[PDB]
Structure 1
Amino acid sequence: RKLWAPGVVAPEYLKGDLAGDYGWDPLGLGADPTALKWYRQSELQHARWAMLGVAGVLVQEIVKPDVYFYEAGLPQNLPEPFTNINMGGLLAWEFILMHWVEVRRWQDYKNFGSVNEDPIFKGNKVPNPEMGYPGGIFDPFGFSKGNLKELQTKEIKNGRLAMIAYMAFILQAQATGKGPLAALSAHLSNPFGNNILKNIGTCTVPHSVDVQGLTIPLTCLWPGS
């Protein structure tokens, strides 16, 4: 197995069972096995939400380049069918739906193989071969019968890359005031101008933007003013 660095002995609790295992854990937070399981679930959740977020920013920049994603949540920028929607009700929808699904998944964490069964239409079920990869209706096309391992590694690697690139999206979104592709094209405008050496230190985000009734406090990741 290739390591995360040349000439580094691998830890004893990282053997190769999990995917994307390079033996890299300098802080040793995965010493406890239950900790290793819960943090594995954390890595999978972060990977998958981050991949969705990266594709979201990218495709919104490809399709309609007017939508600046960092400002896209304000209640007047939303698309065709509704443009003055009450954010309280929208928050209610999101709250109930996401609560149901995430509480269900947590219950799958505490008791392995206990919430597979459909509570309403009782002849439905999904077989999870490993914890965190459900399958079944979550695999409507069935790409998960060839060894499943290389697809685990591909998923987790692409996810790590997506997490880093998404924090890039937010960071240079707050530094230079432009989206991702706009920043790439503006860097291809002149490479020596428009650099990190010049644009940082200026954090173009407002202090507190107003939504319909309340005032959200806003923070940038580093004090630039």
Structure 2
Amino acid sequence: AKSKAIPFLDAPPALSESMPGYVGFDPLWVSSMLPDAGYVKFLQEAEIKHGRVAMLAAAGAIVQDIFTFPGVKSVIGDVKMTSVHDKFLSMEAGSGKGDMAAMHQLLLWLGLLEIATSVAIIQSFKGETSRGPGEFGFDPLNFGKGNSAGSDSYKLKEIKNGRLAMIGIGGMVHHYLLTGKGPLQFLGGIPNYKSCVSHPDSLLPWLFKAVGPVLPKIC
């Protein structure tokens, strides 16, 4: 057993190889952590779910820089990425004092969708359902030519774009944490830290405390 991704290392035991997105890269044997048959499927669903959210997130950050919907600028002000999530929360009930409910409304509708998908994840994990990971049947415009599941070529594209999006969105969030520039502005400023656009502090501010004392703190 030799993995393709790492030729010297032994191939991951649990991974089938017939699964979409498999290049043999599981050095830490996370696939084998739970003995249950459904656990590998749980991992695949998680990856696609992590990918799908990330894909939206990546585009959303870019699009938010490109333009904003009418009237949003007036209420929020000039906050850019995670800062808008914080500002909205300040102006919503329970989280803060205000007349807004954007974050709460998103959570309520996403939560209703996630409870239904959760039942699906449980059923797939115990083997009751034949559904493969991520196959919720959402293909309104025909693309799979009769199956919503899609061809192996397309699912490879979804998995790889989702992985790439996870890395990209993480970079964008982290770059907003110090430069406060946002995706497009940071791209324009290839030499950065020379100029920093001010950004309001995140709801989790303890994590940004070791910049000045242990790290250089160039910004």
TM-score if structure 2 supplies the norm length? 0.70
CA spacing shift, 1:25–1:157, aligned 2, 3 Å: same
Which residues of structure 2 form unaligned runs of 5+? Answer: 92-96, 213-219
Partner residue in 2 for 1:211: none
Quote how far apart the aligned CAs of 1:160 are: 0.4
> Which residue in 1 is equivalent to 2:216?
none
- Flag the 1:142–1:222 CA change in 2: closer, same or farther, 3 A: farther
What is the letter of the counterpart of residue 186 of structure 1?
G
Inter-partner Cα distance in structure 1 for 2:3 and 2:143: 27
2:66 aligned to 22, 42, 62, which one?
A: 62
Which one-letter code corresponds to 1:223 in the other structure?
A
Residue in 2 that maps onto 1:104: 116
The number of residue pairs the alignment matches comes to 186
Q: Which residue of 2 aligns with 1:179?
A: 182
Does residue 161 of structure 2 align to residue 158 of structure 1? yes
CA distance in 2, matches of 1:222, 1:128: 48
Contact 1:206–1:218, Cα closer than 8 Å, also in 2: no
Aligned partner (choices 125, 132, 137) of residue 134 of structure 2: 132
Q: What per-residue deviation string (whole Å, max 9, x for no partner) do you get for residues 103-140 of structure 1?
A: 1111111224xxxxxxxxxxxxxx985232122xx210
Question: Which of 1 and 2 has higher RCO (CA within 8 Å, sep 6+)?
Answer: 2
- Equivalent residue, structure 2, for 1:149: 152
Partner residue, 1:194: 192
Percent of aligned positions that are identical: 29
Q: Work out the CA distance in 2 between the residues paired with 1:45 and 1:164.
A: 14
Matches within 5 A, 1:11-50: 11-31=12-32, 32=35, 33-50=37-54
Gaps of 5+ in 1: 79-83, 113-126, 188-192, 209-215
Structure 1 residue 185, shift from structure 2 partner:
0.8
Structure 1 residue 48 displacement after superposition: 0.1
Q: Contact 1:207–1:219 (CA<8 Å) still a contact in 2? A: no
- For 1:143 and 1:128, how far apart are their aligned partners in 2? 21
Letter in 1 for 2:123: N
Partner of 1:117: none
In structure 1, what residue type is equivalent to 2:170?
M
- TM-score, with normalisation over the residues of structure 1? 0.68
Q: Distance in 2 between matches of 1:11 and 1:128?
A: 24
Residue identity in the other structure for 1:183? F
Q: Which amino acid in 2 is paired with 1:139?
A: D
Identify which range, 29-38 or 65-74, moves more after superposition. 65-74
Summarize the Cα distance change of 1:11–1:218 in structure 2 as closer, same or farther, 3 Å threshold: same
- Equivalent-residue separation in structure 2 for 1:128 and 1:50 (angstroms): 27
The alpha-carbon distance between structure 1 residues 85 and 141, as it changes in their structure 2 partners (threshold 3 A), is farther
- One-letter code of the match for 2:11? A
Match of 1:86 in 2: 99
RMSD of aligned Cα (Å): 3.5
